[PDB]
Amino acid sequence: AQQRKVIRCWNCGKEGHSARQCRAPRRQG
Ligand SMILES: [Zn+2]
């Protein structure tokens, strides 16, 4: 429900958003 899991998006390498949420690199995010 609240989904509280700090994650370092592998996309660019930032923490606070999953790959799909990381709109930096174009690849599932
Ligand atoms: Zn990121």
Domain spans in the chain, listed from the N-terminal domain onward: 1-29
Ligand 1 centroid – CA 16 distance (Å): 7
Are 5 and 13 spatial neighbours (Cβ–Cβ below 8 Å)? Answer: no
* Residue 19: alpha-carbon gap to chain centroid: 4
Structure-solving method: NMR
CA atoms within 13 A on the CB side of 20: 0
3-state class (DSSP) for residue 21: helix
Residue 15 Cα to ligand 1 middle (Å): 6
Burial of 19 (0-12, 13-18, 19+ CB in 10 A): middle
Q: Are 11 and 29 in contact (CB under 8 A)?
A: yes
Centroid of ligand 1 to alpha carbon of 27 (angstroms): 12
